[PDB]
Amino acid sequence: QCQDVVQDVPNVDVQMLELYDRMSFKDIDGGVWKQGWNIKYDPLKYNAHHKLKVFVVPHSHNDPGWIQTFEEYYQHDTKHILSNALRHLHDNPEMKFIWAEISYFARFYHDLGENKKLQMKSIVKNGQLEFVTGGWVMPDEANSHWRNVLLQLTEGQTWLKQFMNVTPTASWAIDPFGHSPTMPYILQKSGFKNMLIQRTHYSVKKELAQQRQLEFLWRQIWDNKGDTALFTHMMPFYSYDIPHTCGPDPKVCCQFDFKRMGSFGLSCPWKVPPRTISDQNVAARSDLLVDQWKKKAELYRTNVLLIPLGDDFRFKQNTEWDVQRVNYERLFEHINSQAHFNVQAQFGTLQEYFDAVHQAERAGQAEFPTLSGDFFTYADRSDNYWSGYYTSRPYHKRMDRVLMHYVRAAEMLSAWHSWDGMARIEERLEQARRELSLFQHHDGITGTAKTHVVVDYEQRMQEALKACQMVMQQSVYRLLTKPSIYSPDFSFSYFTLDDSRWPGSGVEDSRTTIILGEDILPSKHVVMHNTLPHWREQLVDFYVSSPFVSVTDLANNPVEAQVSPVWSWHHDTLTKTIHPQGSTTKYRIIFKARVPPMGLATYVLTISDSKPEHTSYASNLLLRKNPTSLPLGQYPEDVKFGDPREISLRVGNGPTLAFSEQGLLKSIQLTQDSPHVPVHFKFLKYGVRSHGDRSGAYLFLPNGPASPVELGQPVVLVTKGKLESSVSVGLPSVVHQTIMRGGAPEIRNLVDIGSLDNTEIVMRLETHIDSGDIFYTDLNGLQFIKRRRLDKLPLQANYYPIPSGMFIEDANTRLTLLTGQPLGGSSLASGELEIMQDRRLASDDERGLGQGVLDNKPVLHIYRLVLEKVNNCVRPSKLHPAGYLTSAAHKASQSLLDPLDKFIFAENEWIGAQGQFGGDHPSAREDLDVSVMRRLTKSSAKTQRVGYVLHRTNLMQCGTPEEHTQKLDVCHLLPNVARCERTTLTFLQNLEHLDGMVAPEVCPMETAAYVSSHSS
Ligand SMILES: CC(C)(C)c1ccc(CC[C@H]2CC[C@@H](O)[C@@H]3[C@H](O)[C@H](O)CN23)cc1
């Protein structure tokens, strides 16, 4: 039944890792096609019986924020583009136009009067205006999580189905900076038949063009059968603009951009202007244009040619619509009437192009190659590799992952009930989904926008977090209060969220202290939520106003707890040291919470006069020369001091970690008997070139390999507890922390690059693992792909996105680093892993942004570090392009991305409180996730509908007995089920009516969607 994703290497015509190994990547002058060759064709190829069919496709690339904000561009440009498209298409029935960004289209359509709404629907229904992709945005493909690529796709397509009555089946991605196979994966499971891409390495375009492999069936790297395949068109030239879309010679194509004659303030840099088409020049102009088209056609296999016609924010002015349309109409009338050309040219849409290509395929005219792999890391010219944006603006990259999880938790917690309109649940969730979707844009999460635009995206995401908190806390109050007592004010705050890692300690003082006292309040209820569909334990922590606090469950059973101080790090501008201060007023309490699948668990925190029986207190040791006292108020244990030294720590039965005198990891010992395996953390810095091209928001152009950060004699703080221990050190630009709770450690870096211009800070791991030139990185949090370091390419070409994790391995040992934020990284030598923390760049890199990156702010990066023996694991063969996580590594990733949520009851007494929700939910096998749970109907619908996205990853078999778990049937999670359907991933089309109303579990590496219908 299920394909084996480990043991069968797919047979494909093009495999990108293998192609990379063989290619030479020489950057030679190809002539007018600077990165190609002088294309030749046989004029006799086309004739009366075999004509070249040419589709000229007008378009306008509209960024939802870049140099201006979304709203600034809407007011200045996009509202005029859309208004004039409506008028011009209405008045000219043969003219066509494609549109990608639904965030803008929705913003426009809601402001139109009814007369114009009807006109707009008519030009869509008749095929003149065609939506391509239909997502909220055209997202980044490097840093984005697959869950959020799906979220923004669904937001735009749901809008289109409701208001336009259409669902695109062709995708258009002309500007993201390199391309991911996560896109065809999601698109093919969302009803798509075709997709188009543009920004791939110039050497890749040349190689594929020579073999006519620019159109291909793109399947996943593990897919042996080919059921994931999606037909893909790669454009062949340097840009999507008119000079790089008519043919190989931009000096010629520029003459066919009729906006460049002067009055629009545009010109042709190749020094020959366009000229108005007339009866006296149309034969010579047609000669030149058809010659360009026939050259382009030589690179493809059918007699159907795609010619995009557009650029950024084009088709704004009425006069521009006229100048392009009238000149092209004169060319078509001539060309189409001159038999000697054997061409039929017309305005078209993207779908019309793909339909004609496949008609040719079915007529036996062409067969297409199969392809797997990705298209990172992009270079547009010379050694200019776009690996800088894997790290740029890292504060907002981390915020993306925080809001990702809060959107999932708010949608899931509120899905359990139907809500009155007055509760504003749908309103708040729509806002949250739309702001997170907007940020997936290729100038949002990428960190490539102007400073004031980054500020706009941040403000929008903060509003979205506040929306999620409101929805979550109203839902907890309803799920855990006796129904006949439940008395909501939908504007009131019953709970406040407590989040230990966002914005994080030393970033923002945002967390509330639980205030207890004999003369004010003896106790406080807290609740934990677990969005994952299996029973979960996790340590949780809260700030409390006394160290003498104990924890009980809601059966009044004692729960073991640990109290630690609250430590903050300060750059002391007097002593010129970075050192910690302990609170005299607040303390941390830590305990293990145990929470049902997709459920809630309540605990109680109670003050006492003295040390509680079931609460312990951490010891604290400050290692530094020249110490001064550190008082901690009521904290029962005195801080200890010492000169810097090496130290070792072990929590529970977990690993034993050894640290250098500078507070950095030096070894891990897995068990009592086992070796101390060398695993060393080191911080280094890259700089910028003093001559030639400069690093900026997009480009990473280092001045050689990185140099060690000079550490001096840093201050190291060691906290030792029964439940949690840690080592923290104040380094220049980074407070580095290693935390131990009995399994793989958690690493946290508080990164403040300060005023260090032209510096990139990297965290490196050095091991003696015999990895050679191989490492693995993930794609969109969905899959791990094999990388090979290539010494034939420069350092920056060997950097890849690290959206969620990376690893190196040999026959016996693996080291995996999981991340809570997307960052750039590599393995530049055998046994090494490295990941960039932040970058501050004084110069612009000449890709249109017009500024460096000088707006850095403190960010708390989070990680898990997993060292494992792998000699017993069943792994793919040497030729397989994929890799897979172990159970421990996958759970460590989930701990970063989807932790327990923590709620503190706001008032003094919670009347009607209950102890647990979800105790009867099935606890599914560990590789299965409910990625999305979303109610799809408002309260007035007679038949309620709930949508689920189910994802099964693939974990290595390494000899651990599988325990029994329960089957998860999402269609029976809510009562009174009347129907269960399998749908596309956007929920917009029903694909299968399911027997017995049971939703089957999915295969490894597959994602399915189901909708349950319920009688209400
Ligand atoms: C020549 C000059 C002015 C430096 C320049 C260079 C490049 C560009 C286009 C940049 C591309 C790729 C990066 C990307 O950030 C931008 C926006 O998303 C916009 O849609 C055009 N894109 C625009 C202008």
Ligand SMILES: [Zn+2]
């Ligand atoms: Zn763009």
